[PDB]
Amino acid sequence: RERMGHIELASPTAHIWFLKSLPSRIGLLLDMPLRDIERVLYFESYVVI
Amino acid sequence: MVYSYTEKKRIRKDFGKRPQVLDVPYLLSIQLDSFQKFIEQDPEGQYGLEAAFRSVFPIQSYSGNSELQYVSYRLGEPVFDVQECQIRGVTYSAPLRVKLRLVIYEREAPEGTVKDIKEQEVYMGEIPLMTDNGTFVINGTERVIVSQLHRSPGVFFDSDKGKTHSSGKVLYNARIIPYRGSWLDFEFDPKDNLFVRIDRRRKLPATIILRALNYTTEQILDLFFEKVIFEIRDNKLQMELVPERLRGETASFDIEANGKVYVEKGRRITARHIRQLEKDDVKLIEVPVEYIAGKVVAKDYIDESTGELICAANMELSLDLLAKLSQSGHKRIETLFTNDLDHGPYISETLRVDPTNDRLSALVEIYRMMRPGEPPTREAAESLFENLFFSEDRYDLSAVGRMKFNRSLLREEIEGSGILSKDDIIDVMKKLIDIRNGKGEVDDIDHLGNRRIRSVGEMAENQFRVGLVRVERAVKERLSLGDLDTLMPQDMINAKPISAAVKEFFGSSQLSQFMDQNNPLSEITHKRRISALGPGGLTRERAGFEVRDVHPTHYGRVCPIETPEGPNIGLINSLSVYAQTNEYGFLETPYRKVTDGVVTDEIHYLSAIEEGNYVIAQANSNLDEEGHFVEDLVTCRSKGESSLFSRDQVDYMDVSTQQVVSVGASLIPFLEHDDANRALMGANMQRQAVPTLRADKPLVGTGMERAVAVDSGVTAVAKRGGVVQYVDASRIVIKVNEDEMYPGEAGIDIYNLTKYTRSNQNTCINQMPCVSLGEPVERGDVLADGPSTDLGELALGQNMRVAFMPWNGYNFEDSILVSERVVQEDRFTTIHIQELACVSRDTKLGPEEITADIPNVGEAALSKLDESGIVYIGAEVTGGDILVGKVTPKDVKDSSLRVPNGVSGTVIDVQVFTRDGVEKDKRALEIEEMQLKQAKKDLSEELQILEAGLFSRIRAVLVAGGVEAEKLDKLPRDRWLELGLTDEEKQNQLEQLAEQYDELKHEFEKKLEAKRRKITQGDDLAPGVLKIVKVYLAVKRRIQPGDKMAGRHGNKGVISKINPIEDMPYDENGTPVDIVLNPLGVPSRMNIGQILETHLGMAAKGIGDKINAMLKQQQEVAKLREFIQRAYDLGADVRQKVDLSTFSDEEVMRLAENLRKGMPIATPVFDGAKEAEIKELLKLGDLPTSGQIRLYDGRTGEQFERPVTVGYMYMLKLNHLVDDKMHARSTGSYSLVTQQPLGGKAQFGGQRFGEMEVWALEAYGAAYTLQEMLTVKSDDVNGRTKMYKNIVDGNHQMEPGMPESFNVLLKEIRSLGINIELEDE
Amino acid sequence: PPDLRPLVPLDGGRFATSDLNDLYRRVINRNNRLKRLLDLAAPDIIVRNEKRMLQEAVDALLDNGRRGRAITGSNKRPLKSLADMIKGKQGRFRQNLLGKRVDYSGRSVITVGPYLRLHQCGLPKKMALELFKPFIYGKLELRGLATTIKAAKKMVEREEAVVWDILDEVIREHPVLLNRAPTLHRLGIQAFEPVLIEGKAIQLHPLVCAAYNADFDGDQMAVHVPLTLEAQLEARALMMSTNNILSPANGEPIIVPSQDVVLGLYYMTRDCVNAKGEGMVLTGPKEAERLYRSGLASLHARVKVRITEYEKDANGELVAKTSLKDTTVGRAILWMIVPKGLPYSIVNQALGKKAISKMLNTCYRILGLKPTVIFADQIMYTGFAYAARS
Amino acid sequence: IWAAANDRVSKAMMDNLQTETVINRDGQEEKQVSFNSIYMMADSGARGSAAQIRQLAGMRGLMAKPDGSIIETPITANFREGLNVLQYFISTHGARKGLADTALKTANSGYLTRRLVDVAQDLVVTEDDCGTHEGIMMTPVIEGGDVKEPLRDRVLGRVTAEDVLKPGTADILVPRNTLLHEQWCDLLEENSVDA
DNA sequence: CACCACCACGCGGGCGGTAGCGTGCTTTTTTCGATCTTCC
DNA sequence: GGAAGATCGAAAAAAGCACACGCTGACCCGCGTGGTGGTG
RNA sequence: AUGUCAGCGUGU
Ligand SMILES: [Mg+2]
């Protein structure tokens, strides 16, 4: 009833709750528009680091 | 008038005054007729399968080398009968076969030369068939597909009356709703700009849809505006002035023409100046050059010499631009006639806002709207726009859609293509612009003329068309595969999509509902139901207020009172008695044409839209029997509103007083004396009454019981006339008349009555004969009485002796006090049948078997079971008893079906279905033997009749030839075949008759073999199951405190106390009353119908008691004839006339025997018996005229200080029994996820302590009780166990612990990327 | 954990939907495929798509249908994700935490019981026997009538008479919480003393209907059993109907005669002009009642009766005052139930709804709580009896 | 005109119902209050009211179409008498409007109650006196013709915030922190206290 | 020994299609392009 | 005099829509490939 | 020893 499991993700994935629930915490923290974050997240535009 | 044989048994007294001009039509016609249109062979492809096949077929291959065309379709005979389908569980359906031709053309010459033709018939699935009662049998269960009231296809203009923009301005919009396609909307912006939306997408300027239709700016401006010509003079610059254009104008400049100052500068042009200019007929008027700059040029003007655009189309003019135009040589210019109030410049403003400038740009913008992300290409945009509205395969404006479209635009023609065109959209936008300007009015969306009714046929045809287009895509896939020289159409098509679509529609649709079989009225109302819900319709939560109200067009088409009370009120309606459907789906109602004042009898069915123009009088308008209204000022209705009118201005007349109510609402006597709300409750409750074990006729009725009983398929109705040859409690055999005989037939009708079969509401369906041996019958006469039916009349409740008085608070709010006799005589005892299924499947380890031995059980528990493992029929079982002994392999585990706890009764029926291949047990063999014996009995009766006829012919021939009649009589009848005659034509006749006898015997043997094969064919089941055993339990529910009872006038209540017989109030003669009711209900709940019904029932029972007393004295038939004739003649110009002179003595006696328990009275729903007639009928018997008698107290005996109202009232026992409502729980099973107790009564479960209860406890100081309910009673498992052991030990203390639901929620949140925990610190 | 997303056997060889298991399986498939792609050094044109769709699967598992289109299930419908089973009306917060299902509870239709007192409710025998089962087991084991819990269960099932006696013993002063389904305000649930009745419907006091907004109409109600000492004390001291006499919303009384009590008391307190026994002189209310029951004087006869009324002085005691009053027989009869402290002006008039309410208010203000409760019960009894007799 | 006619009919009916009963005294006759069952039920307050009785015996009066406007011709027939088809259809409009309103009111009322409970579920009396000298004014509420609520109802069962002075005398009428029960309210109203 | 029938099964996904699917609610928050204005 | 702050209006997206109970049906991958197995 | 969907109904 209590023990949980875990899956080791091969590639990092964004947590949808923080990304989507307006205002976006990722976007607010990084000061980037939600469109840019959601398009770099789903592999359609590169982003500089 | 002469009465039918069943009616002459008991004639209902009728108080109706107005003669019946039109008889009530068949109630279920709206269900049957439509389905007919679905399956009838139509030479023209307008409705049904023929229309669908014509729409889809022919089917062309990808390459123009071959095709597949459709010739004809045929529906095969159903494999199983309706009864067989119901008892076996299969779906009542018929195979569909289609004649298909495969045409392979010439490869070298594709101009149309053919090479090979292959014709075949292919089977493409089963179509479920409608029974004679307008109901479907899906998976062995009765289903009803209710009609849907949905917005009709067409163009609708509406607006929001200031609900938006906070400014009060109305934003007019227009919608083009197709039957199949995309919706086109034209809305008006707050800034007066026309925008176009497709499928509720982003709005675009309305000129885009015009540009996409190959239209330039000049063409659009020509279409949408009036051109003013400004001819350039030397210095006058005179305009082509129209006097009408001066209306509603401001003269900022002096209007002078013909050397006269017509209008002075600074003066508004009043109507006087407009009229004077109209009289002047002056065209050319001098204009200053400043007036031109404020206008917009109509068309592009080009300086040919220089080849540059001096002015384009549609921009504001200016002084420099005007000078350039003048010097360019352009003498004649055109501009737009625009008025701030008459002709607004909406199109020009929209064009200015519109960014597109060419057809390709507009198409690209439309494509970008429709398909974001995809690259807009010329081909893609062209294809998308062509397929949006101008392709038959994607857009379908139906025939009714086209008719409404043309009518809304005032077009003479009512026929056209099913696709849109440039003209249609242009006209729609023009009409919307006119409506915005002021001309025209918006369309009432809730108008019943704008709402179509879709029946079963239309929906079935649509689903079939969807399946057919899927199949046609699948067959176009295979039609281009080549090698067609060796391919047949049988294997070319696949029937899976059509069958899947039709099955999903008939089994799992929004409107294919379970049929409610509480009583015949329930089924009748359910079949005649119109639901606004369903696909392509309203939603229960978002229905709103304005759509649930009673529109004035509901008169005569939708019942205003019969509607469910709850969330779906006003969205579900019942069809009126006389209402019917057009060919387009719109409802229509009958009317009597009124010509030259005198009302005629020709019936015209007027629709909602057309009936507005005419003036329709009421049903209750007095006539002098010559057709002329007695008074001049008849109350009529013109357009959804009522008013007085002259007697010569009437156009149509209502056909009946029942035209405005439904069938269920017309069964309430004295409906005109009840409040509308109480009438609604009574009508709703009427179709919830369970049928008792003895149907009792209503002493007061409305005369519609006969129609409801006959039309519903609950009673057995003779197909042909004749005499009843054989009567039994189970079957009836009728010897048909020689007139109705068919050639080569024995001529007997066999009716097998259904006895004690469960309905969909777990009630009991039972049919009882109402005829005797030798009694002649006619076509349409009732032979058996179904549930809640007495001699062909609907009988839902019982006639109970009621008294209206308070009785020691036992009828305080709405309670009912019931005498002990009501329980003693079983007046309200009902039978309920419950079905329990044991499914013997196949498991992975092995197949389970239904056997007579179960491990770890005793012989006493197994005593009821036989050696076959199925309980004995007629054995008394109770909760926890084993019914179908089953053991499944683990050696084996007991999984036998058991009677649910709290359920008892007697096993009355066991049905075993076996998959083909599996051996049949002894019980299955016994059931098959019984069915075979019944079939053999029927066929043997037919054979006996036919062989008796043939042997009579043989004996006649023999006695004519050999005159051996005495020898033949002495000889056995069979040996007559052996005996012959001399060599003559007599021998040839005997040989022919013997051959006929042999062939008839062979034919009937073949019939018996066919019946036996059909019985023994076997039933197909779902995968994994090898046997099914269904057991039926019958329980006698007797009335008791807590049971809900009700009358027909909305007066409901719960039985509060079963008073002893001696305690009930009694009259002078010592007869106690049966029911005591609180008078306090009447003044508040304004239903005076119950009081009048009580008085009329008292009068009827007094007449019946007088008849019974006369019968008990063995009085001569003359006295009975005189008394019954006097009773029937009572009234005030009643339409019903009964003549007992022609009745003969014997029938009269029978009639008297039927009237000895109260003469029935029929009270029409709006033409009923008045108070004077009731008093006259009361005075005819030995009863007080006032209707109030003097009662005595049962317990003490003193006279009540005032006379009380006693009488007879019709009481109904609703399907809300206390034994089905009571539940209790102390400790049981719990849910496995939240560790909370289960919910419901079927499974042992506790009541839900909701949030509001927690709030109420918090409002108190209740903290320990709340915590105890939250944790130690429900969630804390350790708390539960410790509390149980403590209370058993006697300590009333708790350990609250921690609810498990909170731990579950904690782990649930923890399962996300969020950490949540409890800190000890 | 698996137990919070269980796989339910379907007794037919198949299993339930198990939405969470489906989403987890989808995520595991995507993760394994991405691992396989990565370990093969796949080009950045293929692993990119697999990573994006793995992110989509994770999105669906955490919040289905949040961004794009919900993962369609086997029934052509959106699936339920982890977030979908916490939020909403069907979520864990509002369906299993704020409210829940509880044991020691039952439900049945209601029925009027006139003989009941204000603090009593009629409970059916079967519901009472089943709800108080643990108490019955404890009492059975305490008195030695059974040797074990199984024996007590067998005795309860066999429906022995001693079981009924024990049940009568255990519910002597054990209040039960009666509740109605729409609990609009605080008075929607109240504590009543159970009286065992033979039947199938719960018998409710006529006076407490107005607080419940209940009608004997087929409406059902639920019964809960407080099973701690603290819970019983809270029910008796806070939730009892005797305590709840003033509405917390505005302080107005909630116990008021409504339909038949008012009619009966109105019929009693009314005067004719030529009734039998008019103008007679009677010694007291007892003589008037005897005369009415003997059929000698009508209930509306105008007579003069010598009555004694008690008034409260400053010291708090009662001082009597006896005098002849001109009244009717019915009012004199009704005076026999009025408590001592009240004056005679209350009943010497035609008693309507407002008059009865004012009389009860004066009784509450002057006398207290117990006299008011007894007076209300007597008023209801007399109103019912004389409405029946009228 | 029709409203006046309905009022006249109702008044005439009530006059003919409430006191028509004429009874002989020991000598001559007289008029007494009627013993009619309907009138007894209405007057005693058991069930019903003047409107329902006037619908039972007098004309049913004007009825309104679903849009809310009044229909010109009223229902001139009682429930004891017969209502024709047109009058019943007219009344069904209002009946259906009321039924739909009461069917759709429940969800909105429940949602509002849920929001109100959740906004104030954490407020509990957890002290005895803050010593606050700040209170609010309370005056009888009067809006152009009627006294909607007397001051006694508004200030009943509440604690004074400051020493209430006798009007025009500057003398304490009630102390600073006295709970205004019935006797204090009588004292306040006997001195004509406004605020 | 290919040869047809039968069952694991596995990874796969929106589904089926030579494209679209949707069309009768109200309130709150975001956001994003178009206008303006205005100001340094 | 043009870029940036202010406005702003429309489009989009999210969140909500009483409680309690009773009953009914209907369903709870897939599917096309590869491997396996009896066979005449 | 479930769940969900759809429908009907009861009491408010
Ligand atoms: Mg009720």
Numbering used by the authors:
A (entry chain J): 99 to 147
B (entry chain I): 1 to 890, 912 to 1342
C (entry chain J): 246 to 635
D (entry chain J): 685 to 879
Q: Any passages from the paper?
A:
RfaH, a paralog of the universally conserved NusG, binds to RNA polymerases (RNAP) and ribosomes to activate expression of virulence genes. Upon recruitment to RNAP paused at an ops site, KOW is released and refolds into a β-barrel, which binds the ribosome. RfaH recruitment requires a 12-nucleotide (nt) operon polarity suppressor (ops) sequence, which induces RNAP pausing.
We wondered how strongly the initial docking of RfaHCC onto the opsHP drives upstream DNA melting and hybrid expansion. Therefore, we assembled an EC on a scaffold in which a WC bp in the upstream DNA would have to be disrupted and formation of a non-WC C:U pair would have to be “forced” into the 11-bp hybrid. Strikingly, the 3.1 Å structure revealed that the ensuing RfaHCC-bound complex was virtually identical to opsPECEnc, with the 11-bp hybrid, even though the C:U bp does not energetically fully compensate for the lost DNA bp. We conclude that docking of RfaH provides a strong driving force for hybrid expansion, leading to a hyper-paused opsPECEnc.
